[PDB]
Amino acid sequence: DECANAAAQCSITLCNLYCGPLIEICELTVMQNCEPPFS
């Protein structure tokens, strides 16, 4: 999925692109593994 890839890519800019509700767990995971907001 794109939402999955977005998290795997450590990007908020991808997270929001498709994750909808999962934006939260997406951003959360990206926080968890990485230093968002992605550039």
PDB file of C-alpha atoms in Angstrom:
ATOM      1  CA  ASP A   1       0.000   0.000   0.000  1.00  0.00           C
ATOM      2  CA  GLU A   2       1.084   3.599  -0.364  1.00  0.00           C
ATOM      3  CA  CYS A   3       0.313   4.323   3.294  1.00  0.00           C
ATOM      4  CA  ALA A   4       2.577   1.391   4.229  1.00  0.00           C
ATOM      5  CA  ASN A   5       5.366   2.538   1.886  1.00  0.00           C
ATOM      6  CA  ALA A   6       5.025   6.088   3.243  1.00  0.00           C
ATOM      7  CA  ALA A   7       5.708   4.874   6.774  1.00  0.00           C
ATOM      8  CA  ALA A   8       8.544   2.659   5.455  1.00  0.00           C
ATOM      9  CA  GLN A   9       9.906   5.777   3.677  1.00  0.00           C
ATOM     10  CA  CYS A  10       9.856   7.766   6.974  1.00  0.00           C
ATOM     11  CA  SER A  11       7.920  10.686   5.441  1.00  0.00           C
ATOM     12  CA  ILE A  12       5.009  12.711   6.763  1.00  0.00           C
ATOM     13  CA  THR A  13       4.654  14.126   3.273  1.00  0.00           C
ATOM     14  CA  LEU A  14       3.981  10.592   2.003  1.00  0.00           C
ATOM     15  CA  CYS A  15       2.004   9.644   5.186  1.00  0.00           C
ATOM     16  CA  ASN A  16      -0.595  12.372   4.623  1.00  0.00           C
ATOM     17  CA  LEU A  17      -0.608  11.641   0.891  1.00  0.00           C
ATOM     18  CA  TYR A  18      -2.769   8.495   1.386  1.00  0.00           C
ATOM     19  CA  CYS A  19      -2.870   7.258   5.003  1.00  0.00           C
ATOM     20  CA  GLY A  20      -6.146   8.994   5.964  1.00  0.00           C
ATOM     21  CA  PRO A  21      -6.914   7.863   9.573  1.00  0.00           C
ATOM     22  CA  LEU A  22      -3.710   5.807   9.640  1.00  0.00           C
ATOM     23  CA  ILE A  23      -1.856   9.162   9.226  1.00  0.00           C
ATOM     24  CA  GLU A  24      -1.660   9.067  13.005  1.00  0.00           C
ATOM     25  CA  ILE A  25      -0.022   5.617  13.414  1.00  0.00           C
ATOM     26  CA  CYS A  26       2.036   6.578  10.327  1.00  0.00           C
ATOM     27  CA  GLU A  27       3.359   9.785  11.851  1.00  0.00           C
ATOM     28  CA  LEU A  28       3.723   7.954  15.179  1.00  0.00           C
ATOM     29  CA  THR A  29       5.817   5.167  13.635  1.00  0.00           C
ATOM     30  CA  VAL A  30       7.885   7.691  11.666  1.00  0.00           C
ATOM     31  CA  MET A  31       8.500   9.518  14.996  1.00  0.00           C
ATOM     32  CA  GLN A  32       9.316   6.145  16.548  1.00  0.00           C
ATOM     33  CA  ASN A  33      11.974   5.195  13.949  1.00  0.00           C
ATOM     34  CA  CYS A  34      12.977   8.543  12.422  1.00  0.00           C
ATOM     35  CA  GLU A  35      13.041  12.349  12.918  1.00  0.00           C
ATOM     36  CA  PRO A  36       9.960  13.796  11.093  1.00  0.00           C
ATOM     37  CA  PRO A  37       8.986  16.056   9.395  1.00  0.00           C
ATOM     38  CA  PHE A  38      10.913  14.435   6.541  1.00  0.00           C
ATOM     39  CA  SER A  39      12.953  16.488   4.101  1.00  0.00           C
TER      40      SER A  39
END
